[PDB]
Amino acid sequence: KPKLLNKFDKTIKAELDAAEKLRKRGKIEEAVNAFKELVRKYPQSPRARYGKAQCEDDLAEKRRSNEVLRGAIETYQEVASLPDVPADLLKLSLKRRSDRQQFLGHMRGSLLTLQRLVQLFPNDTSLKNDLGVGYLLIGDNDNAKKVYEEVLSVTPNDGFAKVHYGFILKAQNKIAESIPYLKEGIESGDPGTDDGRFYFHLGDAMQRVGNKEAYKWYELGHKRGHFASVWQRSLYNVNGLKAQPWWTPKETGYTELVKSLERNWKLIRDEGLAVMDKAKGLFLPEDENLREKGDWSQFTLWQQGRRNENACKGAPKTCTLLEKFPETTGCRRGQIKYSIMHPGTHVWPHTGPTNCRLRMHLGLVIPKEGCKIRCANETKTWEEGKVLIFDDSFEAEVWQDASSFRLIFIVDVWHPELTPQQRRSLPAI
Amino acid sequence: GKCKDGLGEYTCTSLEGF
């Protein structure tokens, strides 16, 4: 299908094929030197340069080397610099370049590449969609929004642009407006729309507006393999881990940590109240659009398995106590934090990002009435000095209708069935 | 932005190559 040979490259097709056959047979190192020889002999050949890049790309995979991949990324660029590069090959080379830049975390580099692609191919809608993904990946939702608004002005029924536009709207708390874009986008079945993120946020958006069809989309999300169940909708998972909303200390095996939290709960409370009284600013408002209403702030001691030294100056004895429990201080997919919630607060139904952690709540200051937490089909209350344990990859909902503040201590632990190797290898969240 | 209590970011993990 693709036309990759310009006029000169057609005259050396026998040599180009021989080198490419070496690559397709898995003789990567022989293919590198073969294409390198062709680049030496024919330094302007775009197909030879692309062959070199692809071989370097394969060599990077074989060696699992970022340095080798950086070489490939530059060679993909060289292809586009050569004279008389066929359009198909130019597009293939810069698209792989961008993709590999994203793989290495060179998001700004990928963005420049994607911008160049859209400039070279102004009518390729899929490339504009890719540019929007580049913006999303660096957290630039405003520019991502403009990209998809441009796509939809020309191709209003582009499903990929709809789901991503809906995703952006919901992230901006434009809940009602996001529902038709997310729904119509998924229903389009266009490549890239069968993605758990869009089922996740469509159902959540619907729950927020009182649309009872929310769970028909969680069920379909479950049927298509995006959710372990309609209740447990995390998207960064290790399959097979025991899945239940509520855990006992003994079921977790972390009984020593629970004992230490409950035996020493008053010193944890007291350092939290001291920060409340003398270092309020260490409590930061919840910033994930999870509240319908109310006031909810958190004072974080560990995140992504990293101690916040300055925060621990505000709770030094608590940080010292917890240092003995790497099952939580080393949980790179959880946090250790105080959480204050005030009356008039309602947290929408939601799930966390991963099934790789379990969440402990230690009650510190609990009004006698008005505070409760639901996980899956079961609602519970906190007790001062007592630990609750739940899996927040299951849907949770929270209410605070007391007449004074509610303070808890949150301690995330690795899921107990995760191996030591998994605990070291899983990317942080 | 980080996914701490929810799942609101386009991606919750960082990209660091191999």
Author numbering:
A (entry chain A): 330 to 758
B (entry chain B): 99 to 116
What does the paper say about this structure?
Unusually, AspH employs two histidine residues to chelate FeII rather than the typical triad of two histidine and one glutamate/aspartate residue. AspH is highly unusual amongst structurally characterised 2OG dependent hydroxylases in employing only two residues, H679 and H725, to ligate its FeII. We report kinetic, inhibition, and crystallographic studies concerning human AspH variants in which either of its FeII binding histidine residues are substituted for alanine.
To investigate the structural basis of the kinetic differences between wt AspH and its variants, the latter were crystallised in the presence of MnII and 2OG or NOG, with or without the synthetic hFX‐EGFD186‐124‐4Ser substrate peptide. The crystallographic studies also unambiguously reveal the presence of only one potential FeII‐binding histidine residue for the H679A and H725A AspH variants. By contrast, the kcatapp ‐values for the H725A AspH variant are approximately half those for H679A AspH, in agreement with the observed lower substrate hydroxylation in our initial turnover assays. The H725A AspH substitution appears to have a more pronounced effect than the H679A substitution on the Kmapp ‐values for FeII, which are approximately twofold and threefold higher than those of wt and H679A AspH, respectively (entries 1 and 2). Strikingly, for H725A AspH, the Kmapp ‐value for 2OG is ≈200 times greater than that of wt AspH and about double that of H679A AspH (entry 3). The H725 imidazole that coordinates FeII opposite to the proposed O2‐coordination site may similarly regulate the stability of O2 (and 2OG) derived intermediates, including the FeIII‐2OG‐superoxide species in catalysis.
